[PDB]
């Protein structure tokens, strides 16, 4: 009478199906999920500095639309723009809006430094009932609407050197009156011109008189432009009418700052990865929540699930049942 | 006296070469090709709706060049532009031609809806011998060349709101006369201007008087522009000369439509994948026919062959 | 009396650590490095034709800034621009500088063919003290500053057909005077205009009078533009002032040419792969030296080391 010694391995009652080279479905004892497919629905307020735009786009906060005044000098890692945002100042357009929004978002700051521009022979601080600031007419806080003084608008020719060791961003504009009467009444000259230049570059804009769609009482518009002045360079502004002047410059920075469109609420929690759907955990290497992300995030993939086997092949005893 | 039992495997006299981790060439009993390297030379007319441009580019069909009038309100999944296509109307350019072509191709339709623009104090329906319709002069069917009425061209100022639930594409233009005499003769004012705007954006174009190369009798030109008006927005057009006015809008869609340059003939057959060389089968995961494709297609790779082994190592006798 | 026969494998006293699927560090008898992480610090002058820009950008050599005259008709596989480069001619800007630089770099040649343009009723060969050529005033060698003759500047209207079988690149410009007095003094007319066109395209530029920052004595500027004329097409130039005329065309080519910013010295040696840090060997499949490369190069990766095992597991003792 001898003895029997059998070698074997475990099995479990409920295995999981995984994919391999040779099988699209085969059963193993256990597996783990590699795709993050859910979010909290909330943007965590740490560890990144989140700035909720509320009723304001970044551009409106930049220009200084009065209901956006609370954003003066703000900073962010991620500026969050809401679908409820609205403009409530002079109607405007920005040629290459997308680029201005991008470069400001990336700079991470609206830090503004006022400069002593000398505008000889014109009236400063023009305002409109389309841009109410308290009970009276007003204007974008960072811009200076220049108009005639007495019976003249002389050729403006002013300079501002950059003697600092950082880049200066200047935001300026051009006023497009609705009629010839408006043009001559504001600027004397029948056709204006704005030329803004540095040593190496220049932009010249001719205003265009005529009607655009009525917005807050006005068929006129302002067009917004920008100019970056590097250390050792100089800004020159030259105009015989229709200039919407800068009051100063924004300080440019580089770093980790960006902007996101989302309606998710901001909550008190901690998450490295942010999507427009809300924050997601980053323990998994892949995610199917949103291709738009900010921070340390899993890579976006199209699959909603991918199972990595964490055990052997599951081979139950055949039952006659 | 015992017995011998030998274990073995098959072989064939002529195997096939495959690549592995350790070998560039190793012989196995069988393999299958993973790169589609051939085409029929023909574009199959199913299952995608193919519209052959013949003598017309998509942009000429859009503007309404007279030899392209047969394309009015046509639709497609894939518009096919031929190298023989030509223009035969007023000479024009489109700044950002590529974008206009792309967005129209993608919309998949030339469906045009006329709108009642009121152009007070100007003559409508200008024509040219460069763009013949029948025995007379003519013009692009979707555009309205405005000129002076009597001795004046007043400031034109019109509006058109978008109260529908779809995007409206408006095509319009600016006329660049060859001389000052032409400018004043057509528009009275010595310098024109066209401003087309919505609530949030605007384009302003100043025409430029002078000669360009002679095309069908003319050194003048038209420049073509577009404006998309979304639901709830409004179009305003403002001009004191040189406006080539829209007659209406094109109804925009989104979906699977595109455009391809090809000279391959269209045939009656079925193929999911189309290239400029013709349709290709899509049973293989890769293809080396053309990086330009439309439909359910193998991915383009640089290799002209890649063999997947479907059998063991071949060790012949 | 029997015998013992033991089967075994080698080991080495100091192995190397490698990564696998299951281990981030495991010891094998030998490995080899797959990431090139160092450079000579020098650009090898073979087998690619290297052209050192020295004090000149490609654009300054193109326009013909006098200290760049030595580059006339030069050719290259790789043009090397140095951080010490400076301009020393009329102050200028190029809208879409990056595109002009790219297309010229890619063409690989500054081969220039002078053409007999007829500029009726104007003075040719204008110069400035901002662009000295020898002791006296001068200008970009490939451009022709036109000004009034006597008391008039007539409308210029000239043509040049492309009857060759290659593409022609024309470089031209527009002068922006500092004051109204400068404008009328040079061109008579109070406002100029430059229109340069082919059959299919056109550019029209309005000059802008006013001050820019002082550079070499001047608050005026020149703006530089380009036009490519294909075989069978025609160039037309039309202007009533402010034109900086082409003297001819550059011959366009296609091929392997490019441009790189680098301060590495050029040396007599052989290397297929060039980076701004200098040439690197290309025996390894990957490199972490610089994402900017030219030639037959390893692919840029973020890792500074990756070890491929070239032996078994090392089990010492
Ligand atoms: C160029 O053409 C356009 C289109 O014809 C034209 O724009 C239109 O002008 C009128 C008059 O200014 C605008 O009417 C306003 O519309 C809003 C509704 O959105 C109303 O709130 C306004 O009502 C107040 O203002 C009136 C005074 O004008 C009062 O009578 C009234 O009691 C209210 O206080 C008013 O109806 C209309 O919106 C625009 N339309 C567009 C699309 O812009 C423009 O004026 C023309 N230009 C010239 C120079 O003629
Ligand atoms: C500005 O200068 C331009 C250059 O001189 C002037 O344009 C020229 O104007 C003349 C006469 O008005 C045109 O001549 C006609 O052109 C065609 C030729 O077209 C082409 O086709 C034929 C084949 O049919 C071919 O042989 C030619 O090579 C052309 O390619 C003829 O059919 C007519 O009989 C006649 O010759 C010139 O073509 C035209 N040239 C260009 C490049 O535009 C322009 O008039 C001047 N502007 C002003 C205001 O004076
Ligand atoms: C078989 O695989 C599954 C994963 O697919 C294993 O279940 C997971 O087990 C881990 C811990 O081993 C759980 O994580 C823990 O979560 C709690 C809070 O829920 C946290 O406080 C702990 O610090 C820890 O992170 C995880 O939730 C769980 N996940 C799921 C989806 O079940 C399971 O343990 C494996 N079985 C065997 C026998 O190994
Ligand atoms: C518009 O305003 C600007 C700034 O006030 C004027 O530009 C300035 O013009 C002066 C010449 O009057 C330049 O000075 C020169 O500097 C060099 C050395 O840098 C010196 O060697 C010369 O002797 C000369 O004094 C000054 O640099 C320049 N400023 C800038 C920023 O470029 C411009 O002339 C005004 N124009 C009109 C028409 O009002
Ligand atoms: C995260 O948000 C995205 C964006 O809203 C969701 O995906 C979209 O949902 C629409 C239907 O409303 C689908 O047809 C599209 O596939 C998605 N749109 C876009 C523009 O990508 C997504 O479901 C959300 N995911 C989670 C987990 O909440
Ligand atoms: C090759 O040159 C590049 C470009 O200057 C060097 O990269 C810089 O060096 C360190 C990190 O390596 C940083 O402080 C700089 O910001 C880097 N600049 C850029 C533009 O990447 C690189 O180190 C050099 N490599 C070798 C091997 O010499
Ligand atoms: C913004 O910051 C600058 C300097 O850092 C300061 O002078 C300025 O007054 C600040 N503005 C506001 C609104 O706090
Ligand atoms: C080789 O493999 C293919 C694909 O599996 C198969 O269709 C073919 O019949 C096989 N040929 C032979 C000779 O076994
Ligand atoms: C397809 O057309 C392209 C582009 O004309 C050509 O280079 C390629 O060789 C063609 N290939 C086949 C398989 O017909
Ligand atoms: C490792 O690799 C090469 C041979 O491929 C040789 O020069 C070197 O001596 C080897 N080193 C060791 C420790 O085996
Ligand atoms: C430039 O190109 C050719 C030389 O092949 C010739 O027409 C011309 O004289 C050359 N000029 C110079 C300066 O070398």
Residue of C306, C260, C296 lying closest to C52 (CA atoms): C260
Q: State CA B166 to chain mean position distance.
A: 21
Note if the bond before C35 is cis, omega within 30 degrees.
no
Query: In angstroms, rounded to a whole number, what is the distance separating the alpha carbons of residues A50 and A76?
Result: 6
B311 three-state secondary structure: coil
Least CB–CB distance from A93: residue in B157, B202, B206: B202
Residue count of chain A: 321
Which residue has its alpha carbon closest to ligand 8 atom 12?
Answer: B30
Verify whether the Cβ–Cβ distance C199 to B208 is below 8 Å. Answer: no
Query: In angstroms, rounded to a whole number, what is the distance separating the alpha carbons of residues B104 and B111?
Result: 11
Residues of chain C numbered 181-240 and touching chain B (CB < 8 Å):
193, 195, 197-202, 204, 206, 233-234, 236, 238
Q: Do C278 and C268 meet the contact criterion of CB atoms below 8 Å apart?
A: no
- Give the pair of three-digit tokens for residue A57: 């786009």
Verify whether the Cβ–Cβ distance C213 to A234 is below 8 Å. Answer: yes
Query: In angstroms, rounded to a whole number, what is the distance separating the alpha carbons of residues C198 and B212?
Result: 7
Query: In angstroms, rounded to a whole number, what is the distance separating the alpha carbons of residues B211 and C107?
Result: 30
- Give the pair of three-digit tokens for residue B152: 């004046």
Query: In angstroms, rounded to a whole number, what is the distance separating the alpha carbons of residues B55 and B67?
Result: 8
Looking at beta carbons, which residues of chain C come within 8 Å of A204? 208, 210
Q: Give the ligand whose atoms come closest to the C-alpha of residue C35.
A: 6
Instruction: Give the torsion sign (CA, A113, A114, A119, A125).
Output: positive
Q: Do A304 and A18 meet the contact criterion of CB atoms below 8 Å apart?
A: no
Q: Which residues line ligand 2 (CB under 6 A)?
A: B 178-179, 211, 213-214, 219; C 157, 159, 234, 236
Residue of chain B whose alpha carbon sits nearest to that of C197 = B212
Q: Do B273 and B40 meet the contact criterion of CB atoms below 8 Å apart?
A: no
A268 three-state secondary structure: strand
Verify whether the Cβ–Cβ distance C93 to A198 is below 8 Å. Answer: no
Q: Do B277 and B81 meet the contact criterion of CB atoms below 8 Å apart?
A: no
Query: In angstroms, rounded to a whole number, what is the distance separating the alpha carbons of residues A197 and A239?
Result: 12
- Give the pair of three-digit tokens for residue A11: 């099995």
Query: In angstroms, rounded to a whole number, what is the distance separating the alpha carbons of residues B128 and B18?
Result: 66
- Output the CA C231–ligand 9 centroid distance in Å: 25
Least CB–CB distance from B212: residue in C193, C197, C206: C197
Task: For A177-215, give one letter per residue: b (16+ CB within 10 A) or e.
Answer: bbeeeebbebbbbeebbbbbbbbbbbebbbbbbbbbbeb
Identify residues after which chain B is interrupted (C–N over 2.5 A): none
Residue of chain A whose alpha carbon sits nearest to that of C215 = A199
- Give the pair of three-digit tokens for residue B130: 């460069």
Q: Which residues line ligand 10 (CB under 6 A)?
A: C 12, 29-30, 310
Which residue has its alpha carbon closest to ligand 10 atom 8?
Answer: C30
> What does the DSSP 8-state code read for residue B266?
E
DSSP states of chain C as a string? ------------SS-EEE--SS-SSEEES-EEE-EE----SSEEEESS-EEE-TT--HHHHHHT-GGGGGGTT-B-SEEEE-TT----SS-EE-TTHHHHHHHHHHHTB--EEE-----TTEE----EEEEEETTEEE--TTEEE-EEBTTB-PPEEEEEE--SSS-EEEEEEEEE-SSHHHHHHHHSSSS-EEEEE-SS-EEEE----S----BTTBS-EEEEEEEEE-TT-EEEEEEEE-EEEESEEEEP--SS-EEEE--PPEEEEE-SEEETTEEE--SSSEE-S-S--EES-PEE-S-S--EEE-S-B----
Residue of A274, A255, A297 lying closest to A50 (CA atoms): A274
Q: How many CB atoms lie within 10 A of CB B2?
A: 4
Query: In angstroms, rounded to a whole number, what is the distance separating the alpha carbons of residues C54 and A152?
Result: 52
Task: For B282-301, give one letter per residue: b (16+ CB within 10 A) or e.
Answer: bebebbbbbeebbbebbebe
Residue of C285, C273, C301 lying closest to C40 (CA atoms): C273
Query: In angstroms, rounded to a whole number, what is the distance separating the alpha carbons of residues C74 and C107?
Result: 11
Identify residues after which chain C is interrupted (C–N over 2.5 A): none
Task: For B58-91, give one letter per residue: b (16+ CB within 10 A) or e.
Answer: bbbbbbbbbbbeebeebebbbbbbbeebebebbb
Least CB–CB distance from A211: residue in B198, B233, B238: B238
Residue of A168, A123, A143, A124 lying closest to A66 (CA atoms): A143
Query: In angstroms, rounded to a whole number, what is the distance separating the alpha carbons of residues A142 and B96?
Result: 34
Kindly report the backbone phi and psi dihedral angles of residue B117, in degrees, each rounded to the nearest multiple of 5, phi listed first.
-65, 140
What's the order of all strands across the beta sheet hosting C299-300? C35-36, C286-287, C299-300
- Give the pair of three-digit tokens for residue B205: 């174009």
Tell me which H or E stretch contains A60: helix A58-63
Pairing label, strands B258-261, B78-81: parallel
Cα separation of the two ends of chain C: 29
Query: In angstroms, rounded to a whole number, what is the distance separating the alpha carbons of residues B55 and A174?
Result: 45
Q: Do A52 and A266 meet the contact criterion of CB atoms below 8 Å apart?
A: yes
B30 lines ligand 8 (CB under 6 A): yes
Least CB–CB distance from C213: residue in A157, A193, A197: A197
Query: In angstroms, rounded to a whole number, what is the distance separating the alpha carbons of residues C43 and C81?
Result: 13
Residue of C193, C88, C213, C206 lying closest to C139 (CA atoms): C88
B310 lines ligand 8 (CB under 6 A): yes
Tell the residue number behind the tokens 């499949």, with chain if given: C285
Query: In angstroms, rounded to a whole number, what is the distance separating the alpha carbons of residues B90 and B142?
Result: 13
Q: Do C303 and C286 meet the contact criterion of CB atoms below 8 Å apart?
A: yes
Smallest CA–CA separation between A202 and chain C, in Å? 8
Tell me which H or E stretch contains A20: none
B191 three-state secondary structure: coil
The CATH classification number of B49-264 equals: 3.90.209.20
Cα separation of the two ends of chain A: 35
Which residues sit opposite B260 in a β-bridge?
B80
Query: In angstroms, rounded to a whole number, what is the distance separating the alpha carbons of residues C97 and A60?
Result: 31
Q: Is A296 exposed, middle or buried (0-12, 13-18, 19+ CB in 10 A)?
A: exposed
Mutate: best of B95, B199, B243, partner A, most A CBs <10 A? B199
Tell the residue number behind the tokens 């223009």, with chain if given: B87
Query: In angstroms, rounded to a whole number, what is the distance separating the alpha carbons of residues C83 and A217?
Result: 54
> What does the DSSP 8-state code read for residue A22?
S
- Give the pair of three-digit tokens for residue A75: 């900073």
């Amino acid at each position: 009478p001898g003895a029997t010694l059998c070698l074997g391995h475990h099995a479990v009652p409920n295995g999981t199906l995984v994919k391999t080279i040779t099988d699209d479905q085969i059963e193993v004892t256990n597996a783990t999920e590699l795709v993050q497919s859910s979010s909290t629905g909330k943007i965590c307020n740490n560890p990144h500095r989140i700035l909720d735009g509320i009723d304001c786009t970044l551009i409106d906060a930049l220009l200084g639309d009065p209901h956006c005044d609370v954003f003066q000098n703000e900073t962010w890692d991620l500026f969050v723009e809401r679908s409820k945002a609205f403009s409530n100042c002079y109607p405007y357009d920005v040629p290459d809006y997308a680029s201005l929004r991008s470069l400001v978002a990336s700079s991470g700051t609206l830090e503004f430094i006022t400069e002593g521009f000398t505008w000889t022979g014109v009236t400063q601080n023009g305002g409109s009932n389309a841009c109410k600031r308290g009970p009276g007419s007003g204007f974008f806080s960072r811009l200076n609407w220049l108009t005639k003084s007495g019976s003249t608008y002389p050729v403006l020719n002013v300079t501002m050197p950059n003697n600092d060791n950082f880049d200066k961003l200047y935001i300026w504009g051009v006023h497009h009156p609705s009629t010839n009467q408006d043009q001559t009444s504001l600027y004397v000259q029948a056709s204006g011109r704005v030329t803004v230049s540095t040593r190496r570059s220049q932009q010249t804009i001719i205003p265009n008189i005529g009607s655009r769609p009525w917005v807050r009482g006005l068929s006129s518009r302002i067009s917004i432009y920008w100019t970056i002045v590097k250390p050792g360079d100089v800004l020159v502004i030259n105009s015989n009418g229709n200039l919407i002047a800068p009051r100063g410059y924004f300080k440019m920075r580089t770093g980790k700052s960006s902007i996101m469109r989302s309606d998710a609420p901001i909550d008190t929690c901690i998450s490295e990865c942010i999507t427009p759907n809300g924050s997601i955990p980053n323990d998994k290497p892949f995610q199917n929540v949103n291709k738009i992300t900010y921070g340390a995030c899993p890579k976006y993939v199209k699959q909603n699930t991918l199972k990595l086997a964490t055990g052997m092949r599951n081979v139950p005893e055949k039952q006659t049942r």
